[PDB]
Amino acid sequence: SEHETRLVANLLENYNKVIRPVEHHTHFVDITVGLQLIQLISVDEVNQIVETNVRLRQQWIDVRLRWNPADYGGIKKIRLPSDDVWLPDLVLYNNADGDFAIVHMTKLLLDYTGKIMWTPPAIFKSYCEIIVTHFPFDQQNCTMKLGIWTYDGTKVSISPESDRPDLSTFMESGEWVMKDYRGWKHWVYYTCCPDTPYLDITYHFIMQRIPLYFVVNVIIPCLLFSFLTGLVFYLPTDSGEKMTLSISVLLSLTVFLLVIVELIPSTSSAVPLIGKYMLFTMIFVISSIIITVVVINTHHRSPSTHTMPQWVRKIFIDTIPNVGVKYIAEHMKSDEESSNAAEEWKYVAMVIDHILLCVFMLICIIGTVSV
Amino acid sequence: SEHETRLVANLLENYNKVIRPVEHHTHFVDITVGLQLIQLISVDEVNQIVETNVRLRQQWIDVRLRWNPADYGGIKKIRLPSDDVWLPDLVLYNNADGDFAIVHMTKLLLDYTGKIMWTPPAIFKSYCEIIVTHFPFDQQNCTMKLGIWTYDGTKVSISPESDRPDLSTFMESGEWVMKDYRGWKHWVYYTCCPDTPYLDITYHFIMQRIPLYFVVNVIIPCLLFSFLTGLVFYLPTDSGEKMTLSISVLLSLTVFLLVIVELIPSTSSAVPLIGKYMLFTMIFVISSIIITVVVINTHHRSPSTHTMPQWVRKIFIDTIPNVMFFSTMKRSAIEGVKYIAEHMKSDEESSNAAEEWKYVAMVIDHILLCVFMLICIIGTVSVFAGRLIE
Amino acid sequence: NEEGRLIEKLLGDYDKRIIPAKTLDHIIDVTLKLTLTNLISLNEKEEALTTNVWIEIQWNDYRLSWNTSEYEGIDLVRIPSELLWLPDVVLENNVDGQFEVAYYANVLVYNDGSMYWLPPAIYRSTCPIAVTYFPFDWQNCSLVFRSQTYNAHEVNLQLSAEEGEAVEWIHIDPEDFTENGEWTIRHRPAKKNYNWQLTKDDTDFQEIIFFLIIQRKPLFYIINIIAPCVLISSLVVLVYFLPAQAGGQKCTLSISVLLAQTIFLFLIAQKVPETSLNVPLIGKYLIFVMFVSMLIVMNCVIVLNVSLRTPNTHSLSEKIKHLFLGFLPKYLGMEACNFIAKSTKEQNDSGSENENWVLIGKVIDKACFWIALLLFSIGTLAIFLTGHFNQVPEFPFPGDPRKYVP
Amino acid sequence: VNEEERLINDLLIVNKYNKHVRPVKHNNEVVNIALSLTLSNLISLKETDETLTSNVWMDHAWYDHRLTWNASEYSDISILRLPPELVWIPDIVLQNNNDGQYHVAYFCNVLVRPNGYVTWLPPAIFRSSCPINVLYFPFDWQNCSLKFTALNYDANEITMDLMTDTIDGKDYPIEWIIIDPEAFTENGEWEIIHKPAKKNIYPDKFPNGTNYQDVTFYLIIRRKPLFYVINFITPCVLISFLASLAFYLPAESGEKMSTAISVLLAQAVFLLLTSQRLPETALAVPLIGKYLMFIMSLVTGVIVNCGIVLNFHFRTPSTHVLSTRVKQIFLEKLPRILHMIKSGIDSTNYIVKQIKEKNAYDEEVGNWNLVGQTIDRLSMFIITPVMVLGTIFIFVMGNFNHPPAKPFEGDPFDYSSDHPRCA
Amino acid sequence: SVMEDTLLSVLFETYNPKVRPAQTVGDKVTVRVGLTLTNLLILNEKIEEMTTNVFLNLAWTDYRLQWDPAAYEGIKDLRIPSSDVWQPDIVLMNNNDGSFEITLHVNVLVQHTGAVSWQPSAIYRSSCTIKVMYFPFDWQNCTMVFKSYTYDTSEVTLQHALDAKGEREVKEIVINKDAFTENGQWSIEHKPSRKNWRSDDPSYEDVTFYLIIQRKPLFYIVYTIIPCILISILAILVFYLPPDAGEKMSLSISALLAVTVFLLLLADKVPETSLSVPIIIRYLMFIMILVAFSVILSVVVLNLHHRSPNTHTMPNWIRQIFIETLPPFLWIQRVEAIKYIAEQLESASEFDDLKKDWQYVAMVADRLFLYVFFVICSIGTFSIFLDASHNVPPDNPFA
C-alpha cells in the first residue's frame, strides 16, 4: 500500500530506537505486562528446571509513533518489526537453561495513537526448586520473575495486565494439573543499586501432579512385595526356600528404591515420604530375615548338643498355644528321646513363625485403617 | 595486493548476486556437482538417520566475473567469499535432522575466465530406511538426493562430476565397509510443476556392517545360555536345582531380549534375524522348563497312588535302554517279629515301585538331552549360516 | 540478462515490511497446501511428531507485477524470500521454538503478481498420545498453521484448490514419499478452523489444521514384548505340578517369574510415554499378570504350609480331611520284643497322618491349578482381544459423511 | 522533545565516538576495569562431566572520558543508558568454560554518569570446568573456580581490578563473590563455605601478552550428604549385615551359600551405581568405593568360609578320616573359648553288627557336624567385628572431612563479606 | 581526537580484508601456526571424538598495515577487531562436528612493521580413531590437523610458530602452566607438531599437532577387574562345594549371571568399532566361558554323584582311571522273619557300597576340576594382564 509505505517511511525517518518513548526525560514509560501460558512443556525434577511455552504480552505508548489517519488513507493500525522500535528489556531472572530475554523478535501492532501491543513467543526454561516431600502425590509451586533489568521505576515502570496469568489457550498437560496461578508485582532494592527501586512481576503456578503413572509403575509392585514379606512367616522351615524369596523380596525392594532415587533430585532439603516408606519397608524385611534365620536355626537345633531352656519351653508351649537284642531296644529308646527333643524345638520355631505372622497382619490391617 | 584489490572492486561494482549468471535468460546455468565423502560419522538405526561428513564440489561459469589478467598484473585466480556471488541452491531432499542446504558458506576459487569452483563442507544427516532383516550381518543402502529446488532443468541444470562419489580421502569407518557407491542423475516431474522436469542427483552408498562387536557382545552369551538350556537335562532331579538353572537361563535371555530390543528400530517392515533367534531361544527355554516340570513330576510320582502303565513300563524299560549304547544305563514276641518283617516287606515293594518312576524319569531325560542338544545346534549353526553363506 | 533489469525494477521502491493491501479493507488471500515427504518419527517420550514436509504458500503481491512484452516475454522470476513480504505462516503447535520453515527458498513471482513459495520444513509438532490401547493404538496428530503477525482483517488463510475443487487433505507425492514402517497413515484430512472465543482481530481467530491419523503396526511389539511376557506368565502355572517336599522349588519358580514380569514392566515403561492419563493396555496386562503371580506365590506358600504339617505340630480335623478327600477328588479327576514292635508301629501311625496332609495339598494344587489356568487364560485373551478390536474410525471426523481423499 | 536524544547525538554522532578505540587520551595510559561477580543461583555441579553451571551477574566498571557531559547544559540529565554495541566495552571472558560460551548471556544496557563513569551489569549462565575430588564422596567438598581474563588487550593497555566499595568513608576491595539475600536461591545439595575473589598476576609472563593478569572467583562448596546417606549408605550396611548373619544358618538348610551370594550381588549392584554417579578419573578411589570394595572382599571371604564349613559338614568316614588334632581342637579348645539248622540266632547276631556300624557311623558324621558349627561360630566372632569396625571407621573418616577454615593455604585473611580487609 | 583514531582511519582508508596480502603478484604469505592447550576436556570413545580447549597462535605479515610510529605519537602496535583485517582461513580439518573455525574471535595485534598476530580461543571437537585393543590399558594418538581451508601452497606457506623469543621455532604443543588443567583420566606423553604434505598433489600442506595420551586405568580396575576376579574365585570355589548341599548350581549360575551383567554394563563404555576386541572384553569373555564350563562340569559331577547301581553300571575304564590313578596324583586317598530281615540289611549294604563308589568318583572328579580350573584361571588371568601392562607408548613419537 502506498499510504502504509509512506507512513512507515515517515515514522522511522528520524526515529532513534535507543531513546525511551517519553516526551520529557523526567517521565516514565508505563508498560502493561501479561503472561499467556500456552503449554507446560516439561518439568525436570532431577535438574529442577521447568520449561514452558509462553507469550509475553507487552503494551506501551510511544509518543513518537503516532499519526493522523486522514493523512494516510484512513490507516489506523500497522504491523512493524520489533527491531525497528524501542523495546522494553524484560529479563527472566530465574533463567536456568536458555535465554534471559526475548529472542524471537516478532512483529508488533501499532495504532495511530502510539499504543503498541507486542506478544512475542518464548520458551522459558526457569529454575524451580521442586518440593520432593509428598512424591508422587505432590504439588509444585514454580515462578517466573520478569523485570526491566536496566531502568529503575522512575524510567520504565511496569504493571501487570491482570492479577492472574492467562491460560485460556493452555494445552492440558496430562502430567500436571494447574491448581492455581497468580502474578504479583514487587519493588526491590538490590545490592547494586540500593538508592532506587527496580520493579518486577513474578508469576507463580501451583500445579498438582497426576500420580497414576508413578502409582502403577512403582507403588503397586512395592505393595505386592510387602505382602510377599509376611508370607515367609507362613512358609514352613521344612521346605527351605524361606531365605530364597525373603532375599528376593529384599532385592526387589532395593531395586525399586534405586528407581525412586533416580526419579528424584539429589537435593537434601527434605526426605520424600515414598523414600521413607521404602526405607522402613526395607528395615522391616531385614528384621524379618533376621527372625527367619533365628527360626531356621531353632528348627534345626541338635537335640543332644543343645538343650531347651525351661522358660522358653514353658512360655512357647503353654501360654501362646492356649492364646544284641538289648542294644537295639536301647538305641530305639534313645532315638525316641532325641526325636521328642527335636520335635520340641521345631514346635517352638513354628510358634515364633505364627507370632511373627500375627504381628505382620496387624501392621497390614492398621495400614488399611490408615487408608 | 593493489592489483587484486582493484580487481575485486571492479568485479563487485555492478554485480547483482540475485540474478543467474547467463548471457541470455533463455540459457541455463550448467553446474557440475560432485560429492566427496570425508567420513561416515554414524548410522543411527533406531532413528534411521545416517550422518556423514561431505564436501559439495560445485563448478560453474559466471560470465560477469571474468577479467583480463594483463590488466591486473597477471592475476589468473582469486578467492572470493561465496556470499558475494550468485550460488546454486542445492538442497538435500531426504534431510532428517539438519540443514537442507549449505550453511557454512566458505570461499570459492574464481579464475579469469569466469569459472567458479566452490567446495563447501557439510554434515548430511539424511534419512536411511535401514533393513533390519540380517542384523548384524546386514548391508544398508543409504542415499542422498540433491536438487536445485527452485529452477527447472532449463535454468540451473546440474550434472554429476563423475559416475561415483569421490572417496579418495575417505577415512575408514571401522564399523562399516563401503561395498559400493554410485550417483545417478534423474529428471523428475513433481505434482507441483508437471510441465517441466527438475533435475536431481542421488548418491547411494551400500555399506556392509562389520559384525565383530555385536557378535562378541550379544550373540556369544546367547549361544552359551542356549547350550545351558540343553544341559539342564543332564542334571539329576534328585539334586533339585533344575528349576534354578532353567530359571537363571530364562532370566538371562529376558535381559538380552531387552538389550537387543534397545538396539533395533521398532519398525515392522521385517522381522530381524536376531529377533527370530531370540524368539526361538525363548520358546526353547519355555519348552525345556515345561519338560523339566513333567520329568520332576514323574520322578516324584507316588508308588501307591500312581501305578505305572504297562505300555510306558514296556517302552521306557525294555526298548529305549537297549537302543542306545553310549550311555551307562542298566539294561507277642513272635508276633512282634512278624510285624516288623511285614513292614520291611511292604517298604521294599514301595521302594522298588518308587525307583521305577525314577528310572523312567531319567530315561526321558536322556532322550530329551539328545534331542535338545541336536535341535540346539541345527537351530543356530544351520540357521545363522544362511546369511553367512551369502 | 533481462531478469536483472526486471528484478532491479521490481525491488526498487519496494520494502518487505508492508502488507500488499491494494486499498483499505483489502484482505490478502493466502492459500496453504501441505506435502508430506516423510513421517520421520513419533517420539512418545516427549509426545512430538517429526515430519518432513513441503509447505506451499500462495498469495498475490500487486507490487511485483510487470509487463511481459516490456521484458522480452519473461513471465516468471525467482526472488529470495528474505527480500519479499511474507504472510508469516507458522506452525503454532511446535514442541521446540521452531515456528517457521527450515530453508527459506526462493519465491516464484509471476508477471501478474502471483507469489508461489514452496519451502521445505522439518516440523516437530505437539500431539498428546492416547496410551489406552498400546501397542494396538492409533494416534490423531495435528499440524496447526497460523499467521503469527496478521489477523483475519488483514489475511485470509484458505486451503488451496486445483480445478475449483479444494484440497482438503495432506498431499502425498508418489515421487518423493517414504513409508514410515511403524505407522500407517489411515486418514490425512485438512480443514480451516476458527475459535469463536476470539474476534477476527486477534491473529488466532483463524487457523488451518492438517490431521495425520496413524495406526501403529504392532507386529514388532507382539514378537518382541508381548509373546515372551505371555510365555513367562503361562510358565507361572507350572508350580502346581512341582512337589512340596523341599524340592521342585515352587516358590523359586513363581518368584523368578514375578521378577521377569518386573523386568518386562521396566522395559515397557522405557517404551511408553509418561502421560499418566491412562494405563497402557500392555501395562494393564502386566499389572494383571503380576497380581496373579503374587497370588500364586501365596498359594504356593499355603500349599507348602498345609502339605508339610505333621500330627506333632498340627491337628488334622476329621471335618476338613473328610470334606477335601471326599468332595474334591470326586468332582475333579482324582526277653520281650513288644517294645520294639510298639515303637515300630508308632512311626506308621505318625507317617500315615503326614500322607493325609500331603494328599490334601495335592487336592488344593489340582483345584487351584484350574482356577489359575482359567484366570490367566481369560485375562490374556480378554486384554489382547481388546487391542485386536481397537479399530481406526471409518471416517476422518466421526460425524462428517466425507472421506477427505483425492 | 527528549533531551536524552540530543545528549546521545552529541556524545556519539557529533563527537565521532569510536567504539574500537580504548577510552584513553594517550596510547601509553591504561584503562582500569573494576570487576565483580554476583551469584544469583548455583544451577548445578555435574560430577560426571565435571561442570559447574551457575547463574551470575557480571559487574564491570570503568571510565570513558568521551562519555562526559555538563549535566546542567542538558536540563540536568544525571544518568544515561546506552547499548553495548554503541560504546567501547572491555571484553572480559570466562577462559575456563566447558562449552564454547565465553561472553555474558544477555548484553543489557550500560549506565553512564556525566563524569564518564560507566557501569555494566549483564547476566550470564556459565558452564565452567571444575575438576572433582572424589576422595571423600559423598562427604566431600569441591573447590571450583571461574577465571575471567582480558584477551582483547594486554596488561599495558587495560588493567583488571576487583570492584571497590566504601564503608564509613574508607574504600576496600570486594575480595569475595557477592551473594544478594533478596536474589539468591540455596542449592539444596551444596552449601557455600568460602567464596573468595582474587586478582592474579603471573610474573613469568610479560605485561604485553594478554596472559599476564586475570580475576578468579572461587566457590568452595560442601555437599549435603543426608540424601546420599539415607538412599545409598544405609541399604548397603543393612544388606551387609545379612552377609554377617549368613554364619548363623545351619548346614542342614540348603540356603547357606545363597544368602551370601545374594548379599555379594547386591553390593556389586551398589558398587556399579556408585561408579555411574562419578567421573572416571584416576586421582583417587572414592570413600564409598573403598568401602564397597572392602565389603565385597569380606563377603567373598564369607562365601569361601561358608564353602569350607559345608565341605567339613558333609565329610563322612567312608571318604574322610577325622584326625585326632582336628577333633580335639574343634571339639574342646574352640567351643570352650566361644562359650558354645540253628542259624536263626546267628542271623540275629549279624543284624546287631550292622546296627553297631550304623551307630558308629552316626557318631562320626555327628562329630563332623560339630566341627562345622565351631568353624561357623569362629568366623561369626572374627568377621562380624571386622565389618562393624570397618563400617564405622570409614564413615567416621568421611564425616570428619570438613573444608578448611581458610580458603587459601598461606593466607591468614578470611575472604568474608562481613570483614573487609582494607576497610 | 586521539592519534590512534587517525592511524586507524589512515590504515583502513582503502584496505580490503577479502584480498590476500601479496605485495607483488605471485608472492606467498608465510603463516606461522602453533597450538596452546589449556584443557583436554574429553575423549569420547563412543563417538571417537576429542574435545579440547585451545589457543591458535597465528602469525603473518600484512604489508598494507605499516606506519611510522614517530608520526603517530609513538604508537608501536595496535589491537584491531579480527574482522577488520585479512586473515588466513586456518581451520581444523579434523573436526568431528561441523565446526571448522575458532570460537572467541579475539582482537588481532598489528605491529608498525606489518606483523599481525592473532590468538583466538576455541573449543575444538576433532576426530580421533580409537585403538580399541588394550582398552582400558591403552594409549591413544589423536591428531589436530590445521590448514587454510581456501588458500593452497601457491598462496600461503605454513610454518611452525616461533618461541616466546624469536630465536627458534616450537615444534610441539605449548602448555601454559598458569592456565592448564590436567585431565584426570589421561596423561600426555608426547605433544609434537609437524608439517605434512601429500604426494600426487603439490598443493596440500597442513600443520598437525599430535597428542599421545596414555589412559590411567583406575576406575576400570576397581570397578570391573576386581569384582570379576572375585567372581572367578567363586567359580573356582564351586568345585570345592559338596554335591550333597544343593548349592552348586546356585553358586555357579549366579557367578555366570554376575559376569554377564558386568559385561553388559561395560558394553556402554567400550567403542562400537569392530576392528578388534578390547582386552577387558576378552578377559570378560574368558571368565564367562570359564564359568560356563564350571557350570557344565558341576552338572556332570552332580550327575555322577546321584548315580546308582540300580540306575547305572560303572564302566571298567572309568573305575580304573579315576579310582586307581587320580587319588595318588591329587591326594584323595580314602523264625523265618529274622532270616529275611537279616538278608535285607545285607542286600542294602552291598548296594550302598556301589553307591559310594559313584560318590567317590564324583569327589575325585571334583578335585581334579578344582586344580585344573585354578591353574587355567590363574594363568589365563595373569597372561591377559601381563601383556596389558606391557602396552606403553613408544619413546619416539614419530611426529
Curated annotation (Swiss-Prot), chain A:
MF-aspect GO terms: acetylcholine-gated monoatomic cation-selective channel activity; transmembrane signaling receptor activity
Topological domain spans for side Extracellular: 1-210
Pfam families to which the protein is assigned, alphabetical: Neur_chan_LBD, Neur_chan_memb
Disulfide feature: 128-142, 192-193
Main subcellular location of this protein, as a coarse class: membrane
Subcellular location field: Postsynaptic cell membrane; Cell membrane
Catalyzed reactions per annotation: K(+)(in) = K(+)(out); Na(+)(in) = Na(+)(out)
Membrane topology: Multi-pass membrane protein
Subunit structure, as described in the record: Pentamer of two alpha chains, and one each of the beta, delta, and gamma chains.
Family: Belongs to the ligand-gated ion channel (TC 1.A.9) family. Acetylcholine receptor (TC 1.A.9.1) subfamily. Alpha-1/CHRNA1 sub-subfamily.
Function: Upon acetylcholine binding, the AChR responds by an extensive change in conformation that affects all subunits and leads to opening of an ion-conducting channel across the plasma membrane.
Protein name: Acetylcholine receptor subunit alpha
Species this chain originates from: Tetronarce californica (Pacific electric ray)
Gene: CHRNA1
From Swiss-Prot, chain C:
Pfam families: Neur_chan_LBD, Neur_chan_memb
S-S pairs: 127-141
Topological domain ranges for the Extracellular compartment: 1-217
Glycosylation sites: 67
GO molecular function: acetylcholine-gated monoatomic cation-selective channel activity; transmembrane signaling receptor activity; transmitter-gated monoatomic ion channel activity involved in regulation of postsynaptic membrane potential
Principal subcellular localization: membrane
Transmembrane segment boundaries: 218-242, 251-269, 285-306, 367-390
Catalysed reaction, written as an equation: K(+)(in) = K(+)(out); Na(+)(in) = Na(+)(out)
Membrane topology: Multi-pass membrane protein
GO cellular component, one term: postsynaptic membrane
PTM annotation, UniProt: Seems not to be glycosylated on Asn-140.
Subcellular location: Postsynaptic cell membrane; Cell membrane
Keyword Cell membrane: yes
UniProtKB keywords: Cell membrane, Disulfide bond, Glycoprotein, Ion channel, Ion transport, Ligand-gated ion channel, Membrane, Phosphoprotein, Postsynaptic cell membrane, Receptor, Signal, Synapse, Transmembrane, Transmembrane helix, Transport
Superkingdom: Eukaryota
Subunit architecture: Pentamer of two alpha chains, and one each of the beta, delta, and gamma chains.
Family per similarity comment: Belongs to the ligand-gated ion channel (TC 1.A.9) family. Acetylcholine receptor (TC 1.A.9.1) subfamily. Gamma/CHRNG sub-subfamily.
Function: After binding acetylcholine, the AChR responds by an extensive change in conformation that affects all subunits and leads to opening of an ion-conducting channel across the plasma membrane.
Descriptive protein name: Acetylcholine receptor subunit gamma
Organism, as annotated: Tetronarce californica
Swiss-Prot record, chain D:
Subcellular location: Postsynaptic cell membrane; Cell membrane
GO cellular component: postsynaptic membrane
Membrane topology, record value: Multi-pass membrane protein
UniProt keyword list: Cell membrane, Disulfide bond, Glycoprotein, Ion channel, Ion transport, Ligand-gated ion channel, Membrane, Phosphoprotein, Postsynaptic cell membrane, Receptor, Signal, Synapse, Transmembrane, Transmembrane helix, Transport
Principal subcellular localisation of the protein: membrane
Positions in the Extracellular compartment: 1-224
Family matches, as InterPro entries: Neur_chan_lig-bd, Neur_chan_lig-bd_sf, Neur_channel, Neuro-gated_channel_TM_sf, Neuro_actylchol_rec, Neurotrans-gated_channel_TM, Neurotransmitter_ion_chnl_CS, Nicotinic_acetylcholine_rcpt
S-S pairs: 130-144
Pfam families assigned to the protein according to its UniProt record, in alphabetical order: Neur_chan_LBD, Neur_chan_memb
Family: Belongs to the ligand-gated ion channel (TC 1.A.9) family. Acetylcholine receptor (TC 1.A.9.1) subfamily.
Subunit details: Pentamer of two alpha chains, and one each of the beta, delta, and gamma chains.
Protein name from the UniProt record: Acetylcholine receptor subunit delta
Organism, as annotated: Tetronarce californica
Gene that specifies this protein: chrnd
From Swiss-Prot, chain E:
SUPFAM superfamilies: Neurotransmitter-gated ion-channel transmembrane pore, Nicotinic receptor ligand binding domain-like
Transmembrane segments: 217-241, 249-267, 283-304, 368-386
Membrane topology category: Multi-pass membrane protein
Residues in coiled coil: none
Keyword Cell membrane appears in the UniProt entry: yes
Cysteine pairs bridged by disulfides in the record: 128-142
Entry keyword Disulfide bond: yes
Family recorded in the similarity comment: Belongs to the ligand-gated ion channel (TC 1.A.9) family. Acetylcholine receptor (TC 1.A.9.1) subfamily. Beta-1/CHRNB1 sub-subfamily.
Subunit field text: Pentamer of two alpha chains, and one each of the beta, delta, and gamma chains.
Annotated protein name in UniProt: Acetylcholine receptor subunit beta
Naturally occurring in which organism (per UniProt): Tetronarce californica (Pacific electric ray)
